[PDB]
RNA sequence: AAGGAACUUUGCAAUCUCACCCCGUAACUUCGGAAGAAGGGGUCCCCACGCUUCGCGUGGGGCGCAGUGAAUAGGCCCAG
RNA sequence: AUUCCUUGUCGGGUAAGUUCCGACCUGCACGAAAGGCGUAACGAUCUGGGCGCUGUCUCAACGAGGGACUCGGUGAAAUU
RNA sequence: GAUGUCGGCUCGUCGCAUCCUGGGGCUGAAGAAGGUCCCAAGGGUUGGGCUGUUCGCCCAUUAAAGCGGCACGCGAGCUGGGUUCAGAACGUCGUGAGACAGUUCGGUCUCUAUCCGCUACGGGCGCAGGAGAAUUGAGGGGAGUUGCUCCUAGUACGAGAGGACCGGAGUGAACGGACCGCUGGUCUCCCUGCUGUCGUACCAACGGCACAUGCAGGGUAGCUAUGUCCGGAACGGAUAACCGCUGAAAGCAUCUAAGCGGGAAGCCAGCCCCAAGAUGAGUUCUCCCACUGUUUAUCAGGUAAGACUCCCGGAAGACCACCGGGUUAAGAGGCCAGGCGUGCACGCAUAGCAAUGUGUUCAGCGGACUGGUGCUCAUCAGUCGAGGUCUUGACCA
């Protein structure tokens, strides 16, 4: 059948002991030089469309 | 180990169709956006390829035809775009990663001539 | 690992131009390498393998050529290091007209 | 290399034509007679190595008959013996020379070239019938 | 004891007389002396040499002081050697002598995560007479209700390579001072561009 | 690579063989078969020539490692 | 394929054969339509041998692709 | 309300009543070769044929080709030949249905690992400042095998035949490590050749598909062995059996009760590798330094040294981690040059009825390899990160 199987329910505790590593990492938003709106370093500012000049249409 | 140098994700005859498939477009549009990585792959192939065109003689014209099956595009590359990068030391094509997408969480990017 | 600036490319060449010898032309077709069999006792012999060339794998200290011969009813192939001390001189005998840098196709 | 179950050509008139290997003895020629193997392992016979064999085809009329268990001394491995100058030799077929407990060919002559490595192995007489010693 | 740092560079062919010999061309650049440890300061005798150079624009502030503490010029690599000395800076000239046997010690090329057939040889099994354990996969990890576990060290897949290594007694064939180049017979560890350390025989015949 | 059943409960498995012309083909037999027994040769292109035409035969010529040149496509035998 | 003693005995083939073929016979417990013995041809049948070929093996190696791993979406199971 | 069964294969590890190597007593031990008892498990202990075998017989070797233990070690590891399902046969028993000390052909052995354990690899925190880097070694792991030839010496020995110890040289085997220069393997589009078909209008030149490379030939780097290189050591300390010096109790004798020495592949040190979470958390060199916050916001907040984030890579790698660069730049792509593989390109000309050949052409094409070059991208910027407890003691004017 389902050959390997668990020997007990894991504590709500232990089940957590585990998860202490799934905590997201909040992006490192940076403030655009022009639109002054926050962008993602190294990419195009989704708001103004700039990256030293304006690449992406408005 | 794995100390080679190239990228795949399809078979062999595909990673060949793609690069030709995008190769044209970029040459036909000057800019196309695409998954970040596929751009990165794409880059050098179009450049070499542009550098091929940069000869003007039939031969060169005919080598390109191998990787540009749309008559028009090849002429564009052959007569419009190739004659222009003359002065520069081959190396024009840039990429500007944009931002993550939605249905797959993949970061896109722009590859422009 | 260390990141010193360097053209390992040439560093090698130097330690390899002290040990690199040039030989006639040839690509295929007959040869007659008249080598030396200094190997016997003290008595230094003189053999002369000779016949078709079927490969030039290499460049520099490692460059070499392979020749096929049928000695006394049984095929024989020798791998010669251009710069191999046991060799005195090589000589053509008849340029060959073939169509590929191998020939193995001839091992039958 | 040569190994058990691997058939060789015979390069002598011992009468034997083809022979199957049986065991790679650690070719012990030296001193008085042939010396006793130097190990019970050793999996490959490299030219100028001695092996025990079994005749699978001997010719009619000849000192050696079909089925006779005999020792031989590999003289041509289709492998590739690498000479110290860095040269390489490889023959089209594997072939050995039947012999006797003193390292002597049961034949009156060798046919085909013989590995020059045999002179090294001290197999003098064998060498002495060799039309060539590549 | 003695010893100097170097960079692997590659192997090639070379004849010493009439016997061709493969050789690993190592470059043991001149090495600086940046700290003399003494069984009176660090409780033990030893030295600190340096190797590749480094632009000062990369050189941390603290690191500068340490190097400046001897007025050497930021290297980028430092390594100790026990019971050594000399005066000035360490090169291979006079250090190693044509004929000496040595122990080259680089870092094995890293093989990533390797099975047992590859990391410990093992033998896996079949390939045709029944299976699912075709070739690799280890056989059995242990016994039964006895040692109801597995032993400490049982060989199993793992990261193979990227380990320090030492190939003893190598014959320094040639030695091209004026180029901190040296040529050793045989193969040295790790790949070209790698840091290799050459010492005197750890203990030789 | 070298070797070639040394594997193994057993060459299981996977190769080889693999089309169509031509030559050739054993024991044994209820003479029908065994037989595609076994074994060997051919097979592409050009041109002339003759043929029952698609096609084919003959002669010369040509190119390659290789010509049912890629897909389909018997491994054979001895003995019970 | 009917044998206990048993791998019977001699021969055969093998370098070496508790299996295989041939005899002999002492048929533990063959036998004549619960058919006896034989038999060309036929078998995805069962046994033993051989030629050929091979990664079955000596030892494994490299390469491909699909999982296995990472991130975005959806998100089970047996068990306890 | 289930402790899966014989045998293999894989993977091992342990005991010694040691199979071989080590040391020793006695021998009816001349020498060589042996017998036998003691001490001694470091390491090693071959490949074939027959059998489901274990066993054993045998072929050829070997220093040897040990015996046992670990649920007759190991099926959540594989097989399944064996035997304790359903089919069928023979002999045998049974009037029969069926049976069997028996024999014989056939017969689905279950993707998903939670806890311990194990192999690798990270995150936290800790180690009384915050950081960069170099180390000591507590302890721990790996390895620990053997033949043959030569020399001494044709000696000692022996009627002779034959023929050593000790010591010193070499050269293999198997086993491990590292490595890819060599010799080979591979190299899934790096070059070419070839077929059928569809398309690029056609001719010519090409592309697609005939694997998930249509086939073939070859092949750089990488990885790789059947290829290379190196190793198992020496000395030392303490000992086993065993041999002994001085020597009483037994005015002698005694390796012993005082004492002292020799002495094994074994033990400890030595070799290579790990290693202070060696929470008893060590040592050394270097850097940043003493900010701000009204008993209403009691500790956080600017920041230093430094580092992460992120970008572009890597001989690093599953992810993390690790190394390198990030314009005061040569990190990677490109680009030029070169190397190396393929093996002479398109086109044109000429020869030929044509197939094709010849020339221009050692052409053309080009993955990863050596360099050079600011052409392209590594922009901009953010986040985190010190002010050093107390007690005793010592030294400073």
CSV table of N, CA and C (backbone and C1' of nucleotides) in Angstrom, one decimal, chain H residues 319-353:
chain,number,residue,atom,x,y,z
H,319,C,P,22.1,24.9,-6.4
H,319,C,O5',20.9,24.9,-5.3
H,319,C,C5',19.6,25.4,-5.6
H,319,C,C4',18.9,25.8,-4.3
H,319,C,C3',19.7,26.8,-3.5
H,319,C,O3',19.4,28.1,-4.1
H,319,C,C1',19.0,25.1,-2.1
H,320,C,P,20.4,29.3,-3.9
H,320,C,O5',20.3,29.6,-2.3
H,320,C,C5',21.4,29.9,-1.6
H,320,C,C4',21.3,29.5,-0.2
H,320,C,C3',22.6,29.7,0.6
H,320,C,O3',22.7,31.0,1.1
H,320,C,C1',21.7,27.5,0.9
H,321,A,P,23.8,32.0,0.5
H,321,A,O5',25.2,31.4,1.0
H,321,A,C5',25.3,31.1,2.4
H,321,A,C4',26.2,29.9,2.6
H,321,A,C3',27.6,29.9,2.0
H,321,A,O3',28.4,30.5,3.0
H,321,A,C1',26.6,27.9,1.4
H,322,C,P,29.3,31.8,2.6
H,322,C,O5',30.4,31.2,1.7
H,322,C,C5',31.3,30.3,2.2
H,322,C,C4',32.2,29.9,1.1
H,322,C,C3',32.8,31.0,0.3
H,322,C,O3',33.8,31.6,1.0
H,322,C,C1',31.9,29.3,-1.1
H,323,C,P,34.4,33.1,0.5
H,323,C,O5',34.8,32.9,-1.0
H,323,C,C5',36.1,32.3,-1.2
H,323,C,C4',36.5,32.5,-2.7
H,323,C,C3',36.3,33.9,-3.2
H,323,C,O3',37.5,34.7,-3.0
H,323,C,C1',35.2,32.4,-4.6
H,324,G,P,37.3,36.3,-3.0
H,324,G,O5',37.0,36.6,-4.5
H,324,G,C5',38.0,36.4,-5.5
H,324,G,C4',37.4,36.8,-6.9
H,324,G,C3',36.9,38.1,-7.0
H,324,G,O3',38.0,39.1,-7.1
H,324,G,C1',35.5,36.6,-8.1
H,325,G,P,37.8,40.6,-6.6
H,325,G,O5',36.7,41.2,-7.6
H,325,G,C5',37.1,41.4,-9.0
H,325,G,C4',36.0,41.8,-9.8
H,325,G,C3',35.2,43.1,-9.5
H,325,G,O3',35.9,44.2,-9.7
H,325,G,C1',33.7,41.4,-10.2
H,326,G,P,35.7,45.5,-8.8
H,326,G,O5',34.2,46.0,-9.2
H,326,G,C5',33.8,46.2,-10.5
H,326,G,C4',32.3,46.3,-10.6
H,326,G,C3',31.6,47.3,-9.7
H,326,G,O3',31.8,48.6,-10.0
H,326,G,C1',30.4,45.3,-9.8
H,327,U,P,32.5,49.6,-9.1
H,327,U,O5',33.1,50.7,-10.1
H,327,U,C5',33.2,50.5,-11.4
H,327,U,C4',33.8,51.6,-12.2
H,327,U,C3',33.2,52.9,-12.1
H,327,U,O3',33.8,53.7,-11.1
H,327,U,C1',33.1,52.1,-14.3
H,328,U,P,34.3,55.2,-11.4
H,328,U,O5',35.6,55.2,-12.3
H,328,U,C5',36.5,54.0,-12.2
H,328,U,C4',37.8,54.4,-11.5
H,328,U,C3',38.6,53.2,-11.2
H,328,U,O3',39.5,52.9,-12.3
H,328,U,C1',38.6,54.7,-9.3
H,329,A,P,40.0,51.4,-12.7
H,329,A,O5',38.7,50.5,-12.5
H,329,A,C5',38.7,49.4,-11.5
H,329,A,C4',37.7,48.4,-12.0
H,329,A,C3',38.2,47.5,-13.2
H,329,A,O3',38.8,46.4,-12.8
H,329,A,C1',36.0,48.4,-13.6
H,330,A,P,40.3,46.0,-13.5
H,330,A,O5',40.0,44.9,-14.6
H,330,A,C5',38.9,44.0,-14.5
H,330,A,C4',38.7,43.3,-15.8
H,330,A,C3',39.7,42.4,-16.4
H,330,A,O3',39.2,41.1,-16.3
H,330,A,C1',38.7,43.8,-18.1
H,331,G,P,39.2,40.2,-15.0
H,331,G,O5',37.7,39.9,-14.7
H,331,G,C5',37.3,38.9,-13.7
H,331,G,C4',35.7,38.7,-13.7
H,331,G,C3',35.1,38.3,-15.0
H,331,G,O3',35.1,36.9,-15.2
H,331,G,C1',33.8,40.1,-14.0
H,332,A,P,35.6,36.3,-16.6
H,332,A,O5',34.3,36.2,-17.5
H,332,A,C5',33.3,35.4,-17.1
H,332,A,C4',32.0,35.8,-17.7
H,332,A,C3',32.0,36.1,-19.2
H,332,A,O3',31.8,34.9,-19.9
H,332,A,C1',30.8,37.8,-18.1
H,333,G,P,32.4,34.8,-21.4
H,333,G,O5',31.3,35.6,-22.3
H,333,G,C5',30.0,35.1,-22.4
H,333,G,C4',29.1,36.0,-23.1
H,333,G,C3',29.7,36.5,-24.4
H,333,G,O3',29.5,35.6,-25.4
H,333,G,C1',28.7,38.3,-23.2
H,334,G,P,30.6,35.5,-26.6
H,334,G,O5',30.5,36.8,-27.3
H,334,G,C5',29.2,37.2,-27.9
H,334,G,C4',29.3,38.6,-28.3
H,334,G,C3',30.4,38.9,-29.3
H,334,G,O3',29.9,38.7,-30.5
H,334,G,C1',30.4,40.5,-27.6
H,335,C,P,30.9,38.5,-31.8
H,335,C,O5',31.9,39.7,-31.6
H,335,C,C5',31.6,40.9,-32.3
H,335,C,C4',32.8,41.8,-32.1
H,335,C,C3',34.1,41.1,-32.6
H,335,C,O3',34.3,41.2,-34.0
H,335,C,C1',34.5,42.1,-30.5
H,336,C,P,35.0,40.0,-34.8
H,336,C,O5',36.5,40.4,-34.6
H,336,C,C5',37.1,41.6,-35.0
H,336,C,C4',38.5,41.8,-34.6
H,336,C,C3',39.4,40.6,-34.8
H,336,C,O3',39.8,40.5,-36.1
H,336,C,C1',39.7,41.4,-32.6
H,337,A,P,40.2,39.1,-36.7
H,337,A,O5',41.5,38.7,-35.9
H,337,A,C5',42.6,39.5,-35.8
H,337,A,C4',43.6,39.0,-34.8
H,337,A,C3',44.0,37.5,-34.8
H,337,A,O3',44.9,37.2,-35.8
H,337,A,C1',43.8,38.3,-32.6
H,338,G,P,44.7,35.8,-36.6
H,338,G,O5',45.1,34.7,-35.6
H,338,G,C5',46.5,34.7,-35.1
H,338,G,C4',46.6,34.0,-33.7
H,338,G,C3',46.4,32.6,-33.6
H,338,G,O3',47.5,31.8,-34.1
H,338,G,C1',45.2,33.7,-31.9
H,339,G,P,47.2,30.3,-34.8
H,339,G,O5',46.7,29.4,-33.6
H,339,G,C5',47.6,29.0,-32.6
H,339,G,C4',46.8,28.2,-31.6
H,339,G,C3',46.1,26.9,-32.0
H,339,G,O3',47.0,25.8,-32.0
H,339,G,C1',44.7,28.2,-30.6
H,340,C,P,47.0,24.8,-33.3
H,340,C,O5',45.9,23.7,-32.9
H,340,C,C5',45.7,23.2,-31.6
H,340,C,C4',44.3,22.8,-31.3
H,340,C,C3',43.6,22.2,-32.5
H,340,C,O3',43.8,20.8,-32.6
H,340,C,C1',42.2,23.9,-31.8
H,341,G,P,43.3,20.0,-33.9
H,341,G,O5',41.7,20.1,-33.9
H,341,G,C5',40.9,19.1,-33.2
H,341,G,C4',39.5,19.0,-33.8
H,341,G,C3',39.5,18.7,-35.3
H,341,G,O3',39.4,17.3,-35.4
H,341,G,C1',38.1,20.6,-34.9
H,342,U,P,39.7,16.6,-36.9
H,342,U,O5',38.6,17.3,-37.8
H,342,U,C5',37.3,16.7,-37.8
H,342,U,C4',36.4,17.6,-38.6
H,342,U,C3',36.7,17.6,-40.0
H,342,U,O3',36.0,16.5,-40.6
H,342,U,C1',36.4,19.8,-39.3
H,343,G,P,36.7,15.8,-41.9
H,343,G,O5',37.0,17.0,-42.9
H,343,G,C5',36.0,17.6,-43.7
H,343,G,C4',36.8,18.4,-44.7
H,343,G,C3',37.6,17.6,-45.7
H,343,G,O3',36.7,17.4,-46.8
H,343,G,C1',38.9,19.2,-44.5
H,344,C,P,37.0,18.1,-48.2
H,344,C,O5',36.5,19.6,-48.1
H,344,C,C5',36.1,20.2,-49.3
H,344,C,C4',36.5,21.7,-49.3
H,344,C,C3',37.1,22.1,-50.5
H,344,C,O3',36.1,22.3,-51.5
H,344,C,C1',38.4,22.9,-48.7
H,345,A,P,35.3,23.7,-51.7
H,345,A,O5',34.9,24.1,-50.2
H,345,A,C5',33.7,23.5,-49.7
H,345,A,C4',32.7,24.6,-49.4
H,345,A,C3',32.2,25.4,-50.6
H,345,A,O3',31.1,24.7,-51.1
H,345,A,C1',32.7,26.9,-48.8
H,346,C,P,30.5,25.2,-52.5
H,346,C,O5',29.9,26.6,-52.3
H,346,C,C5',28.7,26.9,-51.5
H,346,C,C4',28.2,28.3,-51.6
H,346,C,C3',28.1,28.9,-53.0
H,346,C,O3',26.8,28.6,-53.6
H,346,C,C1',29.3,30.4,-51.6
H,347,G,P,26.7,28.4,-55.1
H,347,G,O5',27.5,29.6,-55.8
H,347,G,C5',27.0,30.9,-55.6
H,347,G,C4',28.0,31.9,-56.2
H,347,G,C3',28.5,31.6,-57.5
H,347,G,O3',27.6,32.0,-58.5
H,347,G,C1',30.3,32.3,-56.1
H,348,C,P,27.7,31.4,-60.0
H,348,C,O5',29.2,31.8,-60.5
H,348,C,C5',29.5,33.1,-60.8
H,348,C,C4',30.9,33.3,-61.2
H,348,C,C3',31.3,32.3,-62.3
H,348,C,O3',31.0,32.9,-63.6
H,348,C,C1',32.9,32.4,-60.5
H,349,A,P,31.0,32.0,-64.9
H,349,A,O5',32.5,31.5,-65.2
H,349,A,C5',33.5,32.4,-65.6
H,349,A,C4',34.8,31.8,-65.5
H,349,A,C3',35.1,30.5,-66.2
H,349,A,O3',35.4,30.8,-67.5
H,349,A,C1',36.1,30.5,-64.0
H,350,U,P,34.8,29.9,-68.7
H,350,U,O5',35.7,28.6,-68.8
H,350,U,C5',37.1,28.8,-69.1
H,350,U,C4',37.9,27.6,-68.6
H,350,U,C3',37.4,26.2,-69.1
H,350,U,O3',38.0,25.9,-70.3
H,350,U,C1',37.9,26.1,-66.7
H,351,A,P,37.1,25.0,-71.3
H,351,A,O5',37.2,23.5,-70.8
H,351,A,C5',38.5,22.9,-70.7
H,351,A,C4',38.4,21.5,-70.1
H,351,A,C3',37.3,20.7,-70.6
H,351,A,O3',37.5,20.1,-71.9
H,351,A,C1',37.4,20.5,-68.3
H,352,G,P,36.4,20.1,-73.0
H,352,G,O5',35.5,18.9,-72.5
H,352,G,C5',36.0,17.6,-72.4
H,352,G,C4',35.1,16.7,-71.5
H,352,G,C3',33.6,16.7,-71.9
H,352,G,O3',33.4,15.7,-72.9
H,352,G,C1',33.9,17.0,-69.6
H,353,C,P,32.3,16.1,-74.1
H,353,C,O5',31.0,16.6,-73.3
H,353,C,C5',30.1,17.5,-73.9
H,353,C,C4',28.7,17.1,-73.7
H,353,C,C3',28.4,16.8,-72.2
H,353,C,O3',28.0,18.1,-71.7
H,353,C,C1',27.7,15.0,-73.5
